[PDB]
């Protein structure tokens, strides 16, 4: 097997419509994929995607083309000897690196082409993702990983003991995944735009259908906000558990003081008080609202980033998100990163096709790196699920285990065509 | 005046014929400019360029186009009325921002058309971008900046204090400048791809030029750079001062042994010893190898990450780059925290243009902002000034202060043909 091409697809979802997915920094996203499928001369080929909303998909796009010199001719099996290694080579263009390094558009790109190469890998073994990495022994897991940068806080060998420590009771806990999936929380009655009319009808839904966390958005119009938390709390009643984001909108001083008052809606969190890339802001914030935790993440843009975060006591939660950074090899090792620190991890999810991705990404979590999720909930959206061929599936509030072979980002082949920018 | 169109140019230049600007991290740059040209209905256009090293530059090309669509059609006097609001505006489409945010491929972008308006503004007014800003009001200057994600460590209130401080002596400061011009170093005989024997010459030729301050490239090999460095010492004489760069290719323990291994040539700073986006991390080299300085900030993506560099102390020399992060605006926030911090401002050039950038900031520095300049040291290469209309003039070590209307980075006509990519 020899990665023999790629083609790219700039594709647009017109979800701003009805305002799915708005909050305080993005009042009408236009949810969209830079998606990339990789040829192969066999049966297979990897589908991979990274999520943006409307406008700049095409710099991705620009991106991703870019990366292609660097895989296509590349063996498969070159790559799943040591993928650590591929993953250096990936991201390992000095004159691609200068265009970030690990970051924005060129990082954004990264996370698609590498989670294709995980689709096409999964698909030619005959597992699901999830399965694929955690049947892995604690040295293959470890071989995934490119440690640069992040030697100071998280070596190998510390990575490889935690590996160690998680390997008993894997077949177990893969057991008790297949029996119970595994907990997650609903964003859908949230996004700012909504009125209140269809914020109470979502809130209800959300009760009814057996979620116990529920996020909102704030961070527009204070009034505004202290009103839907309360409208929220009303329909929710006081047993479900509410979180709030505000897309990280506040000045530091402002987040802390605008928190406090939203304090009566007894939030568990606030995430993205205020700019992804500030770390020491965050914990400024997380010092002044506290009891109410902190959370950020979906945008946080590399390994290193992530290691200041968790190594100053800078969040309590953790939310990675599957195509920011450089896709699972490097989620991988930020899940590591938590695991030593004991923080949570809830990925980001929604978007297109985000769940589908994170989904695998918290199963890896449990059954292999920290073997704990009935207190954690991965991010769900029930959006844009229908252009899947094997989109998650959530019943009574959790993500039942992928069972396809892949990563189950794969599109139906219409949508590639009706929604081309 | 009306900004009524845009032009992109893809411009590559073969550097790595001679590996001019090569080093530990960048073994061959081809060194390359995504050119922007504002198009107006009267006599004047606006030139800008961000700064890559090969393949990538069409990446941001492709970002310079997007944010054409938030300049085409502004009216200049809207720009020149509130800066910070056409800044504002530039960088916050929350959809173009989604591929940042203020990182990467957007804000390269954004430091091109950025740049590309203050040199529109300053042919319009008819002077040199430096004068053109030291002839502001503090309050004027102070309108120049968005201060979004900086008011925890620098508010606009003690921002325009420390622009009202320096105001009287600006008229001194002026004088001064016209009389002395800004003291530079020289990268010139540092890159890591030279020969000894070349080596030995471009050493000659610094110390022949009065420069008192010369860079080189380690990073590589420990015993390449004891020998360059033991060669490079014999060369410039025991007076010189000699600073090392690494270009982030080292993990923080690594960082500390190797330059502590070269202590004998006596280096002032080192220069990115790690992750451009590791402010724990330098802070940590920088306790390890004192009393040798640590700078850095060329890749630092935005003021949100130079603020924390700088509040932490994990820096002795700020680094700013004219066209890695929002251009000049960007640029002048991040040199009043470090005014607040008392921490020194060497900007980093070379590349294409990039030191006819820097020379305009680091005199609105002098005259505006901290007013002094003796102690410090612009960077300083001579390649590749042949294909600006109005190169930058280095005599006896310093600058000479820019006087030709605009932002010196306009190029020749000839050279936007025969060098696009
Ligand atoms: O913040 C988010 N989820 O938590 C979303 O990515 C954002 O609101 C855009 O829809
Ligand atoms: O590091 C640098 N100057 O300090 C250069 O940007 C780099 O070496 C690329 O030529
Ligand atoms: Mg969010
Ligand atoms: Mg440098």
Redesign the pocket.
Known sequence: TKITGLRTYDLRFPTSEGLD?S?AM?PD?DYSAAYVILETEGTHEGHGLTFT?GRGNEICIAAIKALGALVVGLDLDWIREDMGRFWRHVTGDSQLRWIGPDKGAIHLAAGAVVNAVWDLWAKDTGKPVWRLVADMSPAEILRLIDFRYLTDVLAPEEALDLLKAAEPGKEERIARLIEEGYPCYT?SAGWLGYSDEKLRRLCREARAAGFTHT?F?VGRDLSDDIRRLTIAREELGEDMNIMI?A?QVWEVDEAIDWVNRLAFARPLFI?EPTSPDDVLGHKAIREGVAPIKVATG?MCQNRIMFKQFIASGALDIVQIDSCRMGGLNEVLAVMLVAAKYDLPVWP?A??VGLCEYVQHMSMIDYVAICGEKDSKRI?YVDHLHEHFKHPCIVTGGAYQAPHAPGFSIEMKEDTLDAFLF
């Open positions: 997915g909050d993005n996203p909303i964003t996020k958005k984001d897309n995430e979906e980001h929604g978007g991010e």
